[PDB]
Amino acid sequence: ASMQKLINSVQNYAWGSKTALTELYGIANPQQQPMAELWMGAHPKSSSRITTNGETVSLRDAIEKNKTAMLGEAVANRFGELPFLFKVLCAAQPLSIQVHPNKRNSEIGFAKENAAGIPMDAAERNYKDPNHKPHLVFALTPFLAMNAFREFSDIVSLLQPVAGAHSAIAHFLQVPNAERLSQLFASLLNMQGEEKSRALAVLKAALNSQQGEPWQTIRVISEYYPDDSGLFSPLLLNVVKLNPGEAMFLFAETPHAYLQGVALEVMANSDNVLRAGLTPKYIDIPELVANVKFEPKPAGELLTAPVKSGAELDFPIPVDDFAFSLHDLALQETSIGQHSAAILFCVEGEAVLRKDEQRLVLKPGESAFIGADESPVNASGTGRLARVYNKL
Incomplete structure (x- = not known):
């Protein structure tokens, strides 16, 4: 219990x-x-x-x-x-x-x-x-x-080999700014009929003349989505x-x-x-454009930089709804405690949890619920445990 x-x-x-x-x-x-x-x-x-x-x-x-x-x-x-x-x-x-x-x-x-x-x-x-x-x-x-x-100039470099695929592409290349990026995103999604096939032909052709990423990712995607305007999306998105x-x-x-x-x-x-994109479902394109910020994000800022304190590796999240941490297990017990309910998931190795007399083993892929009233528990073993909880 x-x-x-x-x-x-x-x-x-x-x-x-x-x-x-x-x-x-x-x-x-x-x-x-x-x-x-x-x-x-x-x-x-x-x-x-x-x-x-x-x-x-x-x-x-x-x-x-x-x-x-x-x-x-x-x-x-x-x-x-x-x-x-x-x-x-x-x-x-x-x-x-x-x-x-x-x-x-x-x-x-x-x-x-x-x-x-x-x-x-x-x-x-x-x-x-x-x-x-x-x-x-x-x-x-x-x-x-x-x-x-x-970044705008990363997108510029990537669209040059398919500049002929759609006028909206040439329009962005002329002035690669947010407004025209937005225009390009919507135009690609709205392509229809021969306009769509013409663009995708230009893209395929490019898959043969360009090596490496993100071309390779496009190839992987096209196996499952051969006729989707979203095949262009790796040229716009990191x-x-x-x-x-x-x-x-x-x-x-x-x-x-x-x-x-x-x-x-x-x-x-x-x-x-x-x-x-990468969907056969209906897209309300105006509504989509209205809910997207066309602002580059430098690749250097994509990953969350965690913070290590003793055995605990916290992944700071800018909301209160949840927190996430990784705990490195050792054969000597370490106390894991929080003010909220928590879920603990064995990522690898094996975890032995202890509260008082109760012992519970988690093998990789198994999880346990710890009620707020039951914090803290002692963890030993090898490998790593992931915890979801609330820092509030």
Whole structure:
């Protein structure tokens, strides 16, 4: 009861890997389903579970019944529920380019969709919270992604070989500024019919005459999205490969995409998503442009710089909703404590948690819920444990 081993949901979305969770963590998949996301938290659709008495209960249900005790008063008063959802993501194919609206615009979209009466669960629901809902991603295997606009002159260099693909490209090259970058982003997304095929032919041709990145990433993408205007997006947006242990915060109003690999992600039970390419779904382009900041982000500023204090490696996050830390285990115990509920996930090695008399082993890929009332616990072993919690 002090420390609770989690039973977690695996979402079998069609883009998931049939093997990654099995290779990494020994998770059984004899039916060979795609295993896209492993969920750690209290999502009302698919809450993690804990064991009673013998029986299991929804973690969400348990929290709901003893909110202050399990969450801590700070989190109870501030959020009224577990304020994060923690995932393992296994992208076996590239996923869609996404933008998260800011606070003001999330309020409006949420309100606009509510006024129009669209169910929260509908596929047309882009806005599920009136707050900006940020994400952090942390690489467990090499993790290929796109994030934010590149420096204007990086984009200039990259578009020259495809200058003939669309007049909007030549227009940007003439004066590579925010206004024309915005115009280019929208024009590419709005290409239709022979205008679209002409542009994609110019791009293909370039895949044969240009070597290295981001051309290679485009090739990887095109296997899954051969007829998507988003094939141009790596020329506009930074392409990053995170090494295992590196992390990146996804800011509002900023196009990004997870392209390949396995990562931890921290987010919330509610999310706001505007799609921006690599999708066969409908894009409201005006609305998208209205929710994007066309401001370059230097590649040097993409990764989150963590802070090491003793055994703890904190990844400072500029919101209160959640915090994220990595803890290096040793054979001598170290105390891990927080004012909030916490979830601890064994990244590698093996962790032995202790609270008083209770002992709990986590092998890689396993997790435990620690209620606010049960902090601190002692951790020993080898490898590393990841913690999601609240610093409030």
